[PDB]
């Protein structure tokens, strides 16, 4: 912020030690740019963050960029603030690194508003105590695994199932249905996958490239090519960009994180570099606090609400490992994405039974919604148990209640499909938004015997059960003709 000039004292990997004047040294969690020198013949600066005060006019930092080509005695500039990133509508439809610099080569972003990424959570008085239901407009998610406004949601689908199409549909739906915006934070983003995602966001209309700032998303990218300091703090950069849209603009923000396991992984890496003693399975000793200081700023204040949808990786496929076990202390709901359902064409490929939610309670969603969701779960579970018997006996050698159960279950399983606004670009179907009220009114009709004289391919890939009856009448006109 002033002439507080430091000099590098140690360079051991991406961890630096800086020496300072005897009275003026930065606080912990304070940015400092290293006025370094590239060997090619130009100057280039490196941003670091103070982690520890070491004694006689000496701190220890962690570089957000690489430390190759740095000498001892380079001028380190204290900045008096944490890492400051640009915020506001100027960060929309653009790609940012951990430092808030644009990396999409569209040009510069105007730092008219800069917030720090290190900030305390909202106060206990400023928190909202209401249990609202975030409505995504997707039938399966709204009915069987409801979302919470101000809560966190874990994506557990592997590679190849409809994950990216799902988050693009969530972005488009929070932009078109509510007045909300979205902030994608890529923790450990593979660079070619980052480019593919940015291209598909340009193409799906989410990132309006013909006119930026009409877009519905802000991209922050902490890549694998980057040191463990950047990959750890990129989630905080994304959360700050989302918290501006909550606080100042009073929107319903949607904060997408990539694998929150790589957040924990970068944290354990920086703790191993700083030399602290490892925790239980080798994680950082500040595991739960490092996770909570992030997850507690994803809340709902009196102004807006940030809802986070974090992809979760389970190492060695167990939920008792400390990174899944400490992530699951913050998840309010869970959607698993099915390889089998993606195969048989039930996009969105959300597993209906393995997706859970703590919002699905009578007190929160109404006794009607709870009872119909439980009845749908029972129907699908009975069909899953009965598939082997139908493979052996057949539908005829069953009983009548079991046969009507099987038919209603096939219709329900095909009704959990949906044509997406963002998947339309290769599928062609115009894409539908289905609120929760039409979802439960359609499932009441498909579950009680009011719509049983219909084909199974009439409920498939529609929304809004009136469209199912209309497509059924058209599929019957195909027969009359």
């Amino acid at each position: 912020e002033k002439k507080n000039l430091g000099r590098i004292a140690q360079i051991i990997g991406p961890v630096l030690d800086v020496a300072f004047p005897p009275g003026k040294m930065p606080n912990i969690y304070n940015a400092l740019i290293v006025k370094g020198r590239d060997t090619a013949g130009q100057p280039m600066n490196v941003t670091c963050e103070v982690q520890q005060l070491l004694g006689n006019n000496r701190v220890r930092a962690v570089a957000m960029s690489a430390t190759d080509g740095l000498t001892r005695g380079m001028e380190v500039i204290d900045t008096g603030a944490p890492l400051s990133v640009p915020v506001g509508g100027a960060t929309l439809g653009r790609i940012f690194n951990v430092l808030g610099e644009p990396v999409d080569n569209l040009g510069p972003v105007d730092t008219r508003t800069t917030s720090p990424i290190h900030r305390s959570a909202p106060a206990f008085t400023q928190l909202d105590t209401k249990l609202s239901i975030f409505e995504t407009g997707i039938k399966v998610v709204d009915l069987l695994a409801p979302y919470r406004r101000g809560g966190k949601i874990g994506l557990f689908g592997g590679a190849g199932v409809g994950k990216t199409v799902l988050i693009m549909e969530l972005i488009n739906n929070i932009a078109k249905a509510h007045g909300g915006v979205s902030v994608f934070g890529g923790v450990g983003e593979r660079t070619r996958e980052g480019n593919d995602l940015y291209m598909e966001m340009k193409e799906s209309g989410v990132i309006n490239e013909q006119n930026i700032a009409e877009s519905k998303v802000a991209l922050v990218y902490g890549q694998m090519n980057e040191p463990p300091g950047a990959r750890m703090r990129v989630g905080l950069t994304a959360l700050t960009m989302a918290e501006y849209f909550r606080d100042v603009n009073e929107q319903d923000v949607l904060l997408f994180i990539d694998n929150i396991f790589r957040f924990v992984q970068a944290g354990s890496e920086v703790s191993a570099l700083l030399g602290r003693m490892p925790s239980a399975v080798g994680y950082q000793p500040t595991l739960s606090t490092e996770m909570g200081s992030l997850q507690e700023r994803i809340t709902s204040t009196k102004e807006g609400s940030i809802t986070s949808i974090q992809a979760v990786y389970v190492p060695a496929d167990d939920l008792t490992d400390p990174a899944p076990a400490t992530t699951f202390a913050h998840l309010d709901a869970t959607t698993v994405l099915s390889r089998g359902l993606a195969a048989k064409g039930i996009y969105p490929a959300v597993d209906p039974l393995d997706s859970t939610s703590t919002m699905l309670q009578p007190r929160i969603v109404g006794e009607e919604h709870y009872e119909i969701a439980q009845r749908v779960k029972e129907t699908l579970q009975r069909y899953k148990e009965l598939q082997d018997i139908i493979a052996i006996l057949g539908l005829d050698e069953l009983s009548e209640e079991d046969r009507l159960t099987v038919a209603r279950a096939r219709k329900i399983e095909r009704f959990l499909s949906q044509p997406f606004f963002v998947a339309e670009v290769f599928t062609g179907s115009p894409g539908k938004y289905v609120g929760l009220a039409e979802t439960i009114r359609g499932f009441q009709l498909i579950l009680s015997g009011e719509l049983d004289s219909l084909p199974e391919q009439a409920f498939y890939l529609v929304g809004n059960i009136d469209e199912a009856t209309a497509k059924a009448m058209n599929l019957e006109m195909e027969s009359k003709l």
């Binding site: 004292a9 140690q10 360079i11 051991i12 990997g13 991406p14 030690d17 060997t39 430390t67 190759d68 080509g69 740095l70 000498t71 001892r72 005695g73 790609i95 990396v103 999409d104 080569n105 592997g158 590679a159 190849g160 450990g188 593979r190 660079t191 070619r192 996958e193 980052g194 480019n195 593919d196 940015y198 291209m199 990218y221 890549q223 694998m224 090519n225 040191p227 463990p228 790589r262 992984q265 354990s268 890496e269 920086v270 703790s271 191993a272 570099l273 700083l274 030399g275 490892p278 080798g282 190492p315 060695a316």
Partner: protein, 500 residues
Amino acid sequence: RADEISKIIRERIEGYNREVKVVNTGTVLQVGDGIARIHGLDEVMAGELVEFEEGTIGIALNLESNNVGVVLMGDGLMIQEGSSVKATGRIAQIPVSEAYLGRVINALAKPIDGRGEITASESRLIESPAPGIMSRRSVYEPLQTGLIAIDAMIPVGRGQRELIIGDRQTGKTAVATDTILNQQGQNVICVYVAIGQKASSVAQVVTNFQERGAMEYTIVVAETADSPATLQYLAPYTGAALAEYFMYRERHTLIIYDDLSKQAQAYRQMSLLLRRPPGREAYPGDVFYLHSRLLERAAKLSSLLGEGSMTALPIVETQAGDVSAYIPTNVISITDGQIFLSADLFNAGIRPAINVGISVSRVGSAAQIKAMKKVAGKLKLELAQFAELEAFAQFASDLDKATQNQLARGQRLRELLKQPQSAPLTVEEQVMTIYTGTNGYLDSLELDQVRKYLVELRTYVKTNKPEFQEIISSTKTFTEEAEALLKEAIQEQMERFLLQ
């Protein structure tokens, strides 16, 4: 031959115009275990090559408050404890040119085959940054690995980084070598990085390359297991720098890192010797950064930077199949897909012992030609049904006829995914093989006849019906005319093979 020495000594005595420059200097404090802590270089930068008094050259890695611990790219035997280290101000470059094709080199891009010297005029840094988001494209071009099981189930694209992960002695080097041999027709500059291998193993690999004729487009970077840890740490980066030169000059390349875990072990050794804080399995905190900085260099450029690409094919050895180990989890998180190998499948006859059900490819069908997808869908579905019904094989007698059909189709589709070492199928041959198998023009043969019949059929079609090869190659689709020609050739070879 008597005046050439006089002319060259006049030339080299007058070329140097008596230049003076300030140099950073330091004195050795303690040398041991390939590390030399040296006092004095207070202006050296991290990663910079420093030359010792006796001719050894080292890399300044950690710059402490008192001394500069350097790692030696050699044996520090003649270091003196008092000798003067002179910094050079350069950061680990290699000379690079198109004259490396047909050569084998070590981690300094110098010949070890003793066939002269590579006249290289340009230069490139060993640790050069990766292509950003805007200098990339989407991977669409196919990389033919010649193995039908990989090309149909786990397809590899140009610019993808695919992990050949497996156990010890399951066929990882065989898969990489089959790919490099298969790259003969396509103009792909292949690079093979032998990290910590036995020297006679690399000799066998390079003699196989020269015999098959794949040495004319290949460069072999070999740093055997007697090398210092710094050279085994630097070898994949020199490989990537050479392949990056060829990539940025609008060419398509392919680089194979043989046992990236060996590089991880070399880096662990030097990091522990530099008294750095260890982590899990005594690996340093930035071994993920090590592998990611290297693998992220494998890009498909952006069609304004030249459309060239570099396909990384790293190899990682698991121990007891413990994929939850530290380095395998790192490289799996970093790479695009994985190609798992199994000792159970390997000893059970199926070679190459690809585990298709657990191998992934995050690029997917975009890495195939239009001809391959049509047969690949049916092959994938039928192989999935066989994987489902594999438990019912002992009770195949007491089953439905459809189930027996799916079981027999599965156990004779498994027979066409077998291959012998160093015999890579072209894309037309594997298109015709997958088509025959997945339709069922070998549903009547016995299991000890499928491989022989397919060999005879492939040779017959390649010899007699070249319209099929031309329509599969020029149009890159499975045309109806190709279907008809293949059915005719199947019937003809079926008669000729029923003749026995």
